[model samples]
Target: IRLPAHLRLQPIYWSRDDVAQWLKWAENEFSLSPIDSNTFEMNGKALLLLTKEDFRYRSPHSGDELYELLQHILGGELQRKIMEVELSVHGVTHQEAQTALGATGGDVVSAIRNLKVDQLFHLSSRSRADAWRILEHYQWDLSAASRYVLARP
Candidate 1:
């Protein structure tokens, strides 16, 4: 339930200093964040979808595995910061599509709160992203959905 898309990482043999430089490149070039304690902020809730069992144990495998784990480590820990705040915007995950049509509303948003496998971590479209914007703009006054509301900035 929690991990990055493990495939996008392209590997290159390098030393520790070289690896950090390479990782930093992806962060700067691809907008990827390295999972680390310093990068996280907790104002409210922090839920992890431990749906995927791959992370159940520890493995010191380096390079891609480390990158994949780091993708989870730094990436998974980041929740509130990952949300786009410019209008209550939300994105699609592969997990939400299986629900019935009109099975939306805040509940659709709730589905996001639970972790599911095979879901797109983030949406790839702008128009789709904006639909969440419209809904949130009108629905911001909602006081009932506080658990999944994610606390506005």
Candidate 2:
């Protein structure tokens, strides 16, 4: 679970610029902490942190893959940030977006991507199956739903 990397050495014992090289590597790789360290304390819990080398070893093909995986692993907070960004782009409040994300299982990336075209959400006693049935009968066309519902068998 990569949290952003610290800019400098944390344990703090410096005589020269020896940590600089690893610091640059850590930031470039987006490792939560330095390649040299193991523990990370974030959100009141200490967790075993991974290094750039460790990630590289797991996915030797591309570090980009590890970056995406880490983003997903850190999605709890990442989703919150994403939701807020999307909300501001569409003039929505934090709580509203937060509620929407929570209701929809926090798929923030998908939600943000689709927000412009389909930001609407409605509450009903009916489940998705019922909604899907209506949609299916309407040929999954929301605009046609109104006209389609006018006819009777």
Candidate 3:
């Protein structure tokens, strides 16, 4: 049963036991493999801080699924914020922002940088391989990459 909103502990404030309960709930709801609670003894703050690699290391069989679930839990508010900022600052479409964020493991800065590089390639009519070469030559500076690509024959 879904906890009422007033009774729910926001994920960041969850204690170790709370987190374990959440994992147990997730396992049954999603029909996921049984996750040993001892394998994840950290509090919610630490749980939120774990990298995808860390998740995989903890539970090889279900780690990816758990990571995706964590993303869903954490992504709702944070993801919208990133998407809003990306759209307002860079004119990235909703889907573009979503794709970039997913590709970058939810790092908004990396996602925006990637979007900028992608835009550069599209404007310059450069293939992906050539674009990477030019961007790499300029140390991934979008403006510098644009200048080099625009000046090329």
Candidate 4:
């Protein structure tokens, strides 16, 4: 969470430079012995593909610790990325965005689409259940759902 701008990039897309920076940062954070840079000269995508055993083979002393850090970054960073997008695009509360994200299986586009439908009904003074019903009736088509709701009295 405290990673600087370089570490802020998603690990899936991290460049080799980014990976090295992360390793250096982690080393300092945990006061770890200098890891052999030659063994870790891969990009983030390659790094994520490493198994626990791979970590041990590369750096026997800190393999388990590094694996945990990788998992921690993967979990926390992905959640934050999703939350940032959902919050900015939909202007929904944190709780609302979190709920919608989970409901849509972390698909931001679907979450936003559902939120848009909900917003339509909400602005018209309709109930949440009503919104859900209309969405279902239209097979989750936002434009069609809005048109039908707006056409009603």
Measured by TM-score, the strongest candidate is 4
What are the RMSD figures for all models against the true structure? Answer: 16.2, 12.4, 9.3, 8.1
lDDT of each candidate versus the true structure: 0.32, 0.41, 0.71, 0.73
Write candidate 4's Cα lDDT for 8-118 as tens digits: 766766789887887788888888888766768888767776778998899888876787787574453445545554554444676788788889887877777678666
lDDT of 3 by residue, 1-153 (tens): 475332275565678888788778778877888899898998776676677799899988788777787667644345444544366434567667777778888777777667776777786667877877887787777677777878877
Model 4 misplaced stretches (Cα beyond 4 Å): 76-153
Better of 2 and 4 by lDDT: 4
* Cα misplacement distance, residue 147 of candidate 3 (Å): 39
lDDT of 1 at 51: 22
- The alpha-carbon root-mean-square deviation between model 1 and the true structure, to one decimal in Å, is 16.2
Cα deviation at 58, candidate 1, in Å, is 9.3
How should the candidates be ordered by lDDT, best one leading? 4, 3, 2, 1
Among all candidates shown, the one with the greatest lDDT:
4
Model 3: C-alpha RMSD to truth? 9.3
Deviating ranges (above 4 Å) for candidate 3: 1-7, 74-153
lDDT, candidate 1, 1-153, per-residue tens:
322243223221133343344444545555544533222122112212222333222212223444354335544323322321211323333223334112433243444432111121122233433435433654542222332333335
